[PDB]
Symmetry: T
């Protein structure tokens, strides 16, 4: 199947806005372009969505559940806090790849826990924006 859903959670629309010492440079719009391009090279179609609203994220997850489509999810802070997002993700029959740009293990202790990792197929963290592209390649070869 061509279709892969890339879903970004709270604050992910802020990439590139604060000082390019940090998660700066690549904007969310640029990230979408990079993803779409890589997906086309791989023979996939990426549908990339971002929201600061948990309810909106839940709706996108429900739609992927109903369509049996794979999901690459960076849930932002909700990674660490939301059982509701886990409940929705546990419905997915297709692969779920959890992605984080930063190395969530190199910061505060509360970031080393994810409600999603135990139900995800796999997890990529700390490899920057390329982590999304690597997830796409996993899905293309599976």
């Amino acid at each position: 199947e061509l279709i892969v859903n890339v879903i970004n959670g709270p604050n992910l629309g802020r990439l590139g806005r604060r000082e390019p010492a940090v998660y700066g440079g690549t904007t969310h719009d640029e990230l979408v372009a990079l993803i779409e391009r890589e997906a086309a090279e791989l023979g996939l179609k990426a549908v990339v969505r971002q929201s600061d609203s948990e309810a909106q994220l839940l709706d996108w997850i429900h739609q992927a559940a109903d369509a049996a489509e794979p999901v690459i999810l960076n849930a932002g802070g909700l990674t660490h806090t939301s059982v509701a997002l886990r409940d929705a993700c546990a419905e997915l029959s297709a692969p779920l790849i959890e992605v984080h740009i930063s190395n969530v293990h190199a910061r505060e202790e509360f970031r080393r826990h994810s409600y999603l990792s135990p139900i995800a197929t796999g997890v990529i963290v700390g490899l920057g924006i390329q982590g999304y592209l690597l997830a796409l390649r996993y899905l293309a070869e599976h």
Copy 2:
């Protein structure tokens, strides 16, 4: 630079030996072949080593430290237990990508802790043997 070190720790020589319901099929020799091939496609040279001996792993890490070469490390059970391996890895100036074949977050609680993740560049788990190939691609694009 061409050279990337792939270092596999205890029990990783056992891939493919127990019932192909599990981490079965791909042998360690096959894994080496897959890695070497992908590395050549990427314009890298992969040097793949496996040992059940922590001391041997430490020596390989020291050599990568001295040569300023990147390391893709799957330390096996020592991931969860060895401060000595962390101490050696903290010396590396080039990237360190932690890889696990299985999703270490979907099993016992003790597997969700890694001495290596806080000092690694990033971490890939649960994406099977392709996780090594994805790490290689990260290193090629950086």
Copy 3:
């Protein structure tokens, strides 16, 4: 008084959609019908609402607070995570019955904690969709 509010939180609109091995069969629309029918047999009027949005749930709780109406609440994942929902529920002067379809004590440890149970009148879990009907009957006899 006739009026009882039944409020369902995130993911509760998904009942009946995934494989009828699981929380499958009864849809949310069917649940509403069952509740309305039981409420009429008991001489009550049930107002049944579901949302994936915490803000919407909070508004429904506020309205029940202002009207001094009882609430039967299945907050879904927010049961385990939301202090805001607890704060809103602590305002209710009429009874609050917490309901869960599944036995929240027979799963992961994080599901055995509820922010709501300490401020609820009582709690029913694991009795399936009938738990809502039993809550209704409690309220009718009180």
Copy 4:
């Protein structure tokens, strides 16, 4: 099948004896009468027993195991402490409904843990003596 066992543990024979500010009013004998009456309205026969002796409770549970009869159990303080009672209850093939009169989540932290909840079909707490009658109705509709 007609037969449902209602089993009450330590101190449950004390209902109604201390000041009717508290769990006062309804005596254990009255509780038995209420249960028997509700059971007959539902087309069941309730066999209601109470003991302060764990060994006696265990024998009643064994008998329900051997007869494949459902059990409504309020184990009193043993809810929070007895692995032996859990071991005996895990043998039951018919439903086990855990009931508590008080809201065990609104008191000391040690009362929020039950050895029985993980192996019970479901749990009703905080709905007073009506919780037993609601358990009976669950069993009648299943």
Copy 5:
């Protein structure tokens, strides 16, 4: 009022039997005699009972609740484990003095917790058999 109940729990009938290096010398019968004598000097009547059966202890506590009589309780190992005994003791309207012969704080960590201390009037530990006599004197002056 004259009457004070002294209630001893499991293993307390073993005083004086194992090597008089330890809680040896004074037998339970001797303890009863010492208590009765001190009580008469104080103008009280002590009713001293011992059982290895929690159910029997519960019955004695119930009787003290119903008679509004003070209780001096050394619950033995049940001090550290029984919520049922606490539930029964919380019914007592007259004073409850918890007594232990040994210093329960000078041994294993699990002995430093008592289900009874938070609901007792007070607690005497480590003063040997005289702790019972001191409890009696407290009750005589109050």
Copy 6:
């Protein structure tokens, strides 16, 4: 600069509605008026906003980040639960003053933890609605 953002989170629109024994009397509209008046006396302009929606709060925080404006934040229950709100607040270059009306240390243990306090400039709790006015005065003198 004149402009200070006062942002109130879930349930803060409920001030003054439940029995004036409690956080009763001052309504949210009154709070806004008090804040605006104090801000004008101090030579500032306060922009006061309240929402029960985390996504809306995040947008207001983003806008303050982009405008480099100070924020006085009472995040309500999200204080204790939301990593996403912390992530957004960590972007602010201007001061962040955390305010709570109640003394969050005098209630349940879960209220003594704040995701925001470690990244805030400072914190005021328990001084009632005047805490907002005191935060304003801090910002005016800095």
Copy 7:
């Protein structure tokens, strides 16, 4: 000395009654016969007793203390909960061998703690009913 006491606690009278997928097949009466036979082959006399009553178990332990006889004890659920049984067992001058049929380390975490193991001579778990026979052989060779 010939005499060894085998003492079985709550629920041990249930062996062989529930579906022979589980601890099924060997009944408690059969277990007694196997033990007696092995004891005679070893030149010992086994006295095998079972009770669901902690008080009865305590009396049997007291008798072994007074007679200076070894004890093979499978305390069932009381293994994990009873300080009183530990107190009684600490009196034994002869060896105490703790036995469990099941591997108590391969189940819930609460089963991995025993009040008895620290005061037992040794412990055998997970070797089925043969664990009793192996304990007997230990005692015969010592």
Copy 8:
């Protein structure tokens, strides 16, 4: 009433002495002057005292208890360690405002606990020396 007691604990006499990168600049004598001036503008009299001696602090607290005078307390390290200071502060009938210059939540975990916060009226941290002046203003408006 005019009189407010400002009490500073151990090390607070060190303000301004170590390198003005840190809590440098304002000396304790300067702090006293700032406080006195602000108090006079508010129509109060501030009595400002500092000691490194817990016993001296206790005496000042006792005097405020006896005089029914409000206290603004920065107990320094004793904030985190002293139950005796809490015991003395619990006697105060007038308001107690806890103040810290630094943000105690932005440092080591042990600094996020205060024995005083649960019994204080409120708490101000991280707003520098102005926190004292803001406490004064709270007391003037109440």
Copy 9:
């Protein structure tokens, strides 16, 4: 020997000063008189001292160590916090009886821990000022 040292720690000089709902009525001077009188009836001499200064308490303990005199100690808040006081008390060769007026187990969890209880002969709590007199009687009979 006649001499017994009664040592009272921080805040104990405050008895009787705050509202006689609480630890009110008996002043410290009255307590001294009661103790002296009881000691004379018992054929002892009580030397009663109180200080809010840990250093002063330590000196009194040292003197009791050097003189091999028994100590009845109510260390106030230092009970829960001071290792130094424990170190000094561990030197005492004569009995050490820990006394608290209030039931330290019926309040906050931090009050249920004492650095002194493990090294004391015994402990009396919750029996009011009579606890001192009962300690005196223990020492007279030993």
Copy 10:
């Protein structure tokens, strides 16, 4: 099948060398002789190996996995620390009996945890060198 592997880990070669108050008397060579003799009486062949090297232990475990041979394992300190040894042992299809000479529950708390017990068939501790012989007898009867 005849063949049983007895594998001893670090420090087990030290038996009998330090003062025969302790694990003294029986040397490792003597242990091997005792095991071989018992195995022959049982109709088995025991292959007994000891190493201080985790890598060597892993190789012996791998060989038992490949040959489908039972293992009696005393991993010494690695019992408490090595996930790698657990990973290797989880491959074994034949029984795994964990043995310890000492009672690991009667010492430091860290010795009461074993990475091996949850995946072993059973566990024998505290029965001295006879524990190996008893394991052999288990395997002979199964």
Copy 11:
């Protein structure tokens, strides 16, 4: 620079007074003499002070801060309890060597924590009074 401050905390004046089985023999005066002599051999001047008063210790630390002089500190029980002493020690610009006579890791668990170790240059424990002399030698060679 010649000058080194040796500061001893509570109870350190008790060295040599209790039975020379223990920290007996060397008195505090002897310790001072040994230190002074070693310091002169090393070309230093040691200023040795001891107090049971935390306030006095704080003053000595302040003076060392102001003079930029090194400190060898054995804070006695305050090692384990005092944040105030840590706050004062964090001001020191010259080296801080923490010394304990006893091995603080070989006793109760609470002694294995030090508020001082994280801010000290280094730590010497368990080497008796020579630990002070070794600290002096460290300072002489640096």
Copy 12:
């Protein structure tokens, strides 16, 4: 006796190799020379060994046990992880001095725990390479 064993564990052969900002400058060979020289000045002979292999370290410890020779041990990462090394060290009859170059209390929390400290004579940390020389001097004076 002349002979002292200095044993260095994993990674200690790396001293001086990574950037002389850090544990840089002194190489392991230089460390050996410094130790040998100091030992000769003290009238001792130091035998200095380093290995990355736990098995090799264990053999060196065994040899020191058999020869009754003192050991100065810096076990590197195994300090924090190895029970096997502790088991071997507990055999030593001569002194064991634990040394670390860095201050293990000033880094991650896992470094503040040592399996060796409770069985060592004493411990020196944070005093750099001179810590070894100071250990040597301790042993020379004892």
